[PDB]
Amino acid sequence: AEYQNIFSQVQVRGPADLGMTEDVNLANRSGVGPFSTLLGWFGNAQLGPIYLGSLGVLSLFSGLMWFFTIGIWFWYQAGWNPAVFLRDLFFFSLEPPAPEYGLSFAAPLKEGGLWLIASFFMFVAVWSWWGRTYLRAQALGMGKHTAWAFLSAIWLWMVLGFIRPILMGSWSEAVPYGIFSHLDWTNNFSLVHGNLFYNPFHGLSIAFLYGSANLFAMHGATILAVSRFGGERELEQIADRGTAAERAALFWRWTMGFNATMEGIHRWAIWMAVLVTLTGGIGILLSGTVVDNWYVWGQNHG
Amino acid sequence: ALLSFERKYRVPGGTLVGGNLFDFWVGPFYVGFFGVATFFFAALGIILIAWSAVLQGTWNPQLISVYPPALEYGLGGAPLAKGGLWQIITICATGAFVSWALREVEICRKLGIGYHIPFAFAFAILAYLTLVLFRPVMMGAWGYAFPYGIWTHLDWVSNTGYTYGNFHYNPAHMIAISFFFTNALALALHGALVLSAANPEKGKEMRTPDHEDTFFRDLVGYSIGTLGIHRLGLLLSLSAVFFSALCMIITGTIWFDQWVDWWQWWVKLPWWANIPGGING
Amino acid sequence: DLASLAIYSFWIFLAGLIYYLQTENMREGYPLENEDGTPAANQGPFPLPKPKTFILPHGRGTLTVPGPESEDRPIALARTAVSEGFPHAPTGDPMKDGVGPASWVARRDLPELDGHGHNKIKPMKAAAGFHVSAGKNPIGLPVRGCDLEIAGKVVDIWVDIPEQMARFLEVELKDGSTRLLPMQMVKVQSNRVHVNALSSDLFAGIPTIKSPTEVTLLEEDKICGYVAGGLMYAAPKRKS
Ligand code: BCL
Ligand code: BCL
Ligand code: BCL
Ligand SMILES: CC[C@H]1c2cc3[nH]c4c(c3C)C(=O)[C@H](C(=O)OC)c4c3nc(cc4[nH]c(cc(n2)[C@@H]1C)c(C(C)=O)c4C)[C@@H](C)[C@@H]3CCC(=O)OC/C=C(\C)CCC[C@H](C)CCC[C@H](C)CCCC(C)C
Ligand SMILES: COC(C)(C)C/C=C/C(C)=C/C=C/C(C)=C/C=C/C(C)=C/C=C\C=C(C)\C=C\C=C(/C)CC/C=C(\C)CCC=C(C)C
Ligand SMILES: CCCCCCCCCCCC[N+](C)(C)[O-]
Ligand SMILES: CCCCCCCCCCCC[N+](C)(C)[O-]
Ligand SMILES: CCCCCCCCCCCC[N+](C)(C)[O-]
Ligand SMILES: [Fe+3]
Ligand SMILES: [K+]
Ligand SMILES: [Mg+2]
């Protein structure tokens, strides 16, 4: 009989919402996209507008170049044959230079040079995109939490593809661009370093990852459960606590003996999440640079 | 002691069992019938884990481990020192978890909120039961379950996985991981957005949901909204766990070879199986 | 050993982090109180954080937290025992008194404003040009309570302008006045709207709003509190 707020029962639409202006250069917003009723059962129906600008174009272009550089090598591996391309789509792989070439940019296209090219395009696309997350907050007068959080992800990615290869002296230590091949890289990395389950930073990463699923199931469910008192209007519950915020706190206090605020829960959140890649990148960066075998290291409980 | 706004909510009511008999708090904790059940099951279980530590003969927390009956016992009982304790402790654990959920339900009732939290918790319980009850029973032995020990259960994860090669190729595992990773991305963004609106640049007024919508649209062309993101977080994390359980419930039951080899269905399709070139011709 | 140093440092960092987080989450509700209002003796090992100040938009002021904590309302409950830890029995009608799961908080008796300073929530009729875009339009449908009697009819939907979502149904009663029902506590069906939380006699008891085209935070809490309170307190008149 009772309703659950997982999907809306009634959608309502008004004029396309063009957004707050603050210090944003409006010359760079698109106009609105379509409205999707399908999206609208779960979240907002409105696609767009989006902001371009120079950095956006750079990122987007640069990111496509990465993607098409990887895809040109795949068609090539397929001898230009479409049926073979789909077939072996997950088996293709753009691999980095062999160890002989070390950190040099001298390796031929077909044996690493293409990987460096694609890696270059990716490096540009991500960092431009990072700067994008800062700049769009700045235009709107908002805190920089999103760019600080994104930087945690970037740290792991940087460690895997750039920082660890340099410290180990060779690009051959980096991750290849392919679906199956990256999983093989991953497995092989654990095996070669004595099993990552013995790397305390790996185990922390995990705790945070599983922790994030805890916390978002918890938080997400809490807000849904008090959404009949307006719980999802979190910024106003912060400025002016209502029964939604109090019943939320109290559910948890009565369940496990302590509890959050409508603001502080989001600090638990930002941190649980960022600590995944944060501890994680330390774990990898140390692997092979400083510890050759986590089993061994672990036996000297240290 | 009470939070400053708590008294008005501490009324009688909402119990599922016992009426007013266990309708009270102890400090901050609500009790209830299911609070008593939880205590019993957890206390029994801890006592027994400690007893098991005495038979294994250690008190180190990094060494205590309680293993299930060996495979030769099938689905029967085993003497307490050779898997039976694990068996009793698993009943306690299940008792304690389910009680914890039903007590959460009682708290919801008192507080006049939705049942989403314990409903969500129930997915974690279903994963635990997949590994310690459902999957072992379909495989014919308690011994396919994981042992209760900090480092030993990790040993079991590695051995179980490598029995099927790289477990990476279990396709339900791939999906699960996708949801775990996506969930964490979402958590990072959500926490960061709300905090960026409530804590703006020095001197400025608090931003609004309008700014949060505007921010995401600026960055990626879409905002899912303040209701939607809570709907999303719930879904991503539950979907991760549902697919976790699915990836294990099928492993050793309907699929039991190297998971890598499963993918050959695709490669071996008539339309392109025999065309040469590529990785597989 | 570098990895040893890194891990020891992290555990230290993590402990500071838990302290920062725990204390930040003590900016409401603390200090702890006895069942009578007065500061409890044992506050715990975590001290209150130094205050912080939110600047509210639209001239609405600041909030500074932690700060002095009061309910700013009568609480119609009384003790049912001689020691800490039991329930507190309603002294009147808990629906009418707004206690228990009928509770409301004394929020600011103005309406939440969008980022332009306009009321966030309007009846759809006054919100240009918002309309139902999908699903069954409830407007026109008779409203049914948990006793299975018609308590009224839906005459509008109150919508959140900037998030473009339904938030209440405005319902007209036998006497011709209206009430807001939270969107989240109705099942819209094809021939009716169903409300499990309230019997048909309890609709009139829903708190009413002072102006007919806006709703304040205070009124929202009274409405939502009252309707949810129904689950516990209208469960005698419900029904199989
Ligand atoms: C999910 C798939 C695997 C599994 C794979 C892994 C891998 C891989 C890792 C762990 C790790 C952990 N696992 Mg495990 N683990 C499994 C099932 C369990 C179960 C269970 C089903 O009941 C429990 C209680 C644990 C508990 C634990 C912790 C000891 C540790 C950090 C968990 C965490 O932070 O999660 C998120 C949850 C929170 C942050 C909430 C807090 C939960 C606390 C920390 C639980 C304490 C458990 C306590 C020591 C058990 C004693 C119980 C007594 C009755 C008190 N695992 C199953 C078998 N687990 C990490 C580790 O470091 O191992 C040494 C790690 O790398
Ligand atoms: C056999 C394999 C090994 C193993 C080998 C590894 C290796 C190797 C690593 C991990 C890592 C991790 N392992 Mg492990 N791991 C094992 C078993 C496990 C088990 C388990 C058995 O239950 C679990 C739960 C985990 C869990 C984890 C995570 C905690 C951690 C990755 C965190 C993360 O968010 O990465 C995902 C997030 C990122 C990679 C960040 C990327 C961000 C960038 C910027 C995004 C760019 C996007 C790009 C431009 C594309 C754009 C397209 C868009 C559509 C626009 N491992 C076993 C032992 N594991 C990682 C780690 O940190 O180890 C410490 C890692 O390197
Ligand atoms: C070498 C090992 C294999 C591998 C072998 C396995 C095996 C085997 C399993 C997994 C499972 C998982 N793998 Mg794997 N996996 C590998 C590599 C990875 C990598 C990676 C980056 O390489 C990642 C990210 C993952 C991720 C995952 C997840 C999909 C899943 C773990 C989460 C889960 O099930 O939660 C579900 C959550 C629970 C079970 C926790 C239940 C909590 C209960 C209900 C409450 C406990 C309360 C506690 C006692 C409280 C203490 C009280 C105090 C107050 C705190 N695997 C490698 C290739 N993987 C597991 C899975 O899917 O399980 C279903 C699984 O069994
Ligand atoms: C710290 C924990 C988690 C985390 C945090 C995190 N990630 C983040 C952020 C944060 C805080 C961001 O702000 C940033 C973001 O913008 O999110 C929306 C981001 C981000 N996280 C992303 C991915 C990501 N995060 C991951 C993980 C994680 N991120 C961790 C789990 C992973 C994993 C698990 O592997 C992935 C894959 C991106 C969505 C974004 C970084 C975007 C970026 O750098 O862009 C460059 C690339 C392109 C612009 C184009 C690529 C090409 C396309 C593949 C194909 C074509 C489609 C195209 C868009 C069509 C255009 C057609 C034209 C002709 C018009
Ligand atoms: C349909 O056909 C077309 C042609 C249209 C396009 C099809 C394209 C296809 C099918 C593309 C497929 C792409 C795939 C599968 C990509 C998979 C990528 C994966 C799984 C990546 C995983 C990990 C990547 C990591 C960790 C990379 C890190 C990279 C860096 C840190 C950048 C480092 C930069 C370097 C090394 C260059 C440095 C150079 C200078 C000059 C400083
Ligand atoms: C994550 C975005 C995709 C959303 C797709 C979900 C569609 C399900 C719609 C359910 C229909 C609801 N109902 C019964 C009121 O019509
Ligand atoms: C936001 C903070 C949340 C705190 C969660 C901490 C869980 C710690 C679990 C122990 C991990 C064990 N190991 C092997 C890494 O040492
Ligand atoms: C943020 C929305 C994107 C969801 C991506 C989740 C990753 C899994 C991709 C496979 C689709 C899952 N499912 C259930 C439809 O099969
Ligand atoms: Fe939230
Ligand atoms: K209208
Ligand atoms: Mg959990």
Swiss-Prot record, chain A:
GO terms for biological process: photosynthetic electron transport in photosystem II. One of its GO terms (cellular component) is plasma membrane-derived chromatophore membrane. (7R,8Z)-bacteriochlorophyll b binds at H182, H202. It is a multi-pass membrane protein. The chain crosses the membrane at residues 53-79, 110-139, 142-167, 197-225, 259-285. One of its GO terms (molecular function) is metal ion binding. Pfam families: Photo_RC. Fe cation binds at H219, E234, H266. It is found in: Cellular chromatophore membrane. Keywords: Bacteriochlorophyll, Chlorophyll, Chromophore, Electron transport, Iron, Magnesium, Membrane, Metal-binding, Photosynthesis, Reaction center, Transmembrane, Transmembrane helix, Transport. A ubiquinone binds at W252. It comes from the Bacteria. PROSITE patterns: REACTION_CENTER. The reaction center is a membrane-bound complex that mediates the initial photochemical event in the electron transfer process of photosynthesis. Reaction center is composed of four bacteriochlorophylls, two bacteriopheophytins, two ubiquinones, one iron, and three highly hydrophobic polypeptide chains (designated L, M, and H). Belongs to the reaction center PufL/M/PsbA/D family. This is Reaction center protein M chain. It comes from Cereibacter sphaeroides.
Curated annotation (Swiss-Prot), chain B:
Residues 56-82, 139-170, 251-281 are periplasmic. Residues 1-31, 112-115, 199-224 are cytoplasmic. Fe cation binds at H190, H230. It comes from the Bacteria. It holds the Pfam family Photo_RC. Signal peptide: none annotated. GO terms for molecular function: bacteriochlorophyll binding; electron transporter, transferring electrons within the cyclic electron transport pathway of photosynthesis activity; metal ion binding. Keywords: Bacteriochlorophyll, Chlorophyll, Chromophore, Electron transport, Iron, Magnesium, Membrane, Metal-binding, Photosynthesis, Reaction center, Transmembrane, Transmembrane helix, Transport. The chain crosses the membrane at residues 32-55, 83-111, 116-138, 171-198, 225-250. Its main location: membrane. A ubiquinone binds at F216. GO terms for biological process: photosynthetic electron transport in photosystem II. One of its GO terms (cellular component) is plasma membrane-derived chromatophore membrane. (7R,8Z)-bacteriochlorophyll b binds at H153, H173. The keyword Nucleotide-binding does not apply. The keyword Transmembrane applies. The reaction center is a membrane-bound complex that mediates the initial photochemical event in the electron transfer process of photosynthesis. Reaction center is composed of four bacteriochlorophylls, two bacteriopheophytins, two ubiquinones, one iron, and three highly hydrophobic polypeptide chains (designated L, M, and H). Belongs to the reaction center PufL/M/PsbA/D family. This is Reaction center protein L chain. It comes from Cereibacter sphaeroides.
Curated annotation (Swiss-Prot), chain C:
One of its GO terms (molecular function) is bacteriochlorophyll binding. Its cofactor is a bacteriochlorophyll; a bacteriopheophytin; Fe cation; Mg(2+). Binds 4 bacteriochlorophylls per trimer. Binds 2 bacteriopheophytins per trimer. InterPro entries: Bac_photo_RC_H_C, Photo_RC_H, Photo_RC_H_N, Photo_RC_H_N_sf, PRC-brl_dom, PRC_barrel-like_sf. One of its GO terms (cellular component) is plasma membrane light-harvesting complex. Residues 22-240 are cytoplasmic. Keywords: Bacteriochlorophyll, Chlorophyll, Chromophore, Electron transport, Membrane, Photosynthesis, Reaction center, Transmembrane, Transmembrane helix, Transport. It is found in: Cellular chromatophore membrane. Heterotrimer composed of subunits L, M, and H. Belongs to the reaction center PuhA family. This is Reaction center protein H chain. The gene is puhA.
